[PDB]
Write a protein that binds this ligand. Structure first.
Ligand code: HEM
Length: 148
């Protein structure tokens, strides 16, 4: 595909500083859906404000985990059926922690935001479409973890 190449190329820019980019993703996410903040409970405590999350080593480790899963999806963009079982279990895990499946579309929008701000004029409508499709396929796999 041409789509798969637009993904690979766009990601190369982002994957050189994944925490920096990931931080954009989550900052945006909390700006859109502040009700997600209490779901990151480390040591039984909740963050009061979004900026509190950015000082947590464990939250930052979750950003790195996120970025690594997306990297896995990109690496496998030609065939994502190889990550399907893993993504399904990742979905189950997030169900357990309290994440609503609908929140994953906000995460999608946050990812697109982060790509748009990183790439600027290189973020073409076809790049966006490609990434929407990829992210969509990831969430489809993960959604099996809400058994459906
Ligand atoms: C939508 C909001 C999200 C919330 C609120 C959230 C929250 C959490 C929490 C609480 C954990 C367990 C603690 C931890 O490992 O840090 C976790 C684990 C994880 N999250 Fe997320 N997460 C979200 C989205 C994502 C997304 C989009 C991805 C990947 C694309 C991701 C990948 C992971 C991974 C890889 C783990 C480790 C799971 C394991 O193997 O045990 N998360 N997440």
């Amino acid at each position: 595909r041409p789509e798969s190449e637009l993904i690979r190329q766009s990601w190369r820019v982002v994957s050189r500083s994944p925490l920096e980019h990931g931080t954009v993703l989550f900052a945006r996410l909390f700006a859109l859906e502040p009700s997600l903040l209490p779901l990151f409970q480390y040591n039984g405590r909740q963050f009061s404000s979004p900026e509190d999350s950015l000082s947590s080593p464990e939250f930052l480790d979750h950003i790195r985990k996120v970025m690594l899963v997306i990297d896995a999806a990109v690496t496998n963009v030609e065939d994502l059926s190889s990550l399907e079982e893993y993504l399904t279990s990742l979905g189950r895990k997030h169900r357990a922690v309290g994440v609503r499946l609908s929140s994953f579309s906000t995460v999608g929008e946050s990812l697109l935001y982060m790509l748009e701000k990183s790439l600027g004029p290189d973020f073409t409508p076809a790049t966006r479409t490609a990434w929407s499709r990829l992210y969509g396929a990831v969430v489809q796999a993960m959604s099996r973890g809400w058994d459906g």
